[PDB]
Amino acid sequence: QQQPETEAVLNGKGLGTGTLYIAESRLSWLDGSGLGFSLEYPTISLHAVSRDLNAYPREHLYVMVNAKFGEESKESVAEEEDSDDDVEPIAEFRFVPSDKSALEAMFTAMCECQAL
């Protein structure tokens, strides 16, 4: 399945405006600046969907995932204290389609993927 018109926002600062095509092997997105790029499976963690309109008359697929930083560090020293966190521990990704047909198709993609 593929998405017609939809914009992509990733981890808090929204970067992405174009089309999203879901591939069984991975997810491929096209950037509105004439640049196509794909990601290894979507970060499905906390996704908000509203197939039925009642409280919010709008379509939008919001999915937020918590990311942990560590592995290698040079500017900061390893420690169990974070009194001053300059970077957010959670990244919120918002993928919102501007087509009711794109919202229902994405829900069938997520609903079918979550069930399988």
How was this structure obtained?
NMR
DSSP strand pairing (17-23 vs 61-66): unpaired
**What does the DSSP assignment read for 41-68?**
S---SEEE--SS-SS--S--EEEEEE--
Query: Up-side HSE of residue 49: CA atoms within 13 Å toward CB?
Result: 16
Distance from chain centroid for Cα 3: 14
Whole-number Å distance between alpha carbons of 20 and 36: 10
Query: Up-side HSE of residue 22: CA atoms within 13 Å toward CB?
Result: 16
Structurally, at CATH architecture level, domain 1-116 sits in: Roll (2.30)
In the chain, what are the helix, strand and coil shares in percent, each to the nearest 5? 15, 35, 50
**CA dihedral sign, ordered 12, 93, 64, 98:** positive
> Which residues are 13's β-sheet partners?
10
CB 96 within 8 A of CB 9: yes
Burial class (CB in 10 A: 0-12, 13-18, 19+), 79: exposed
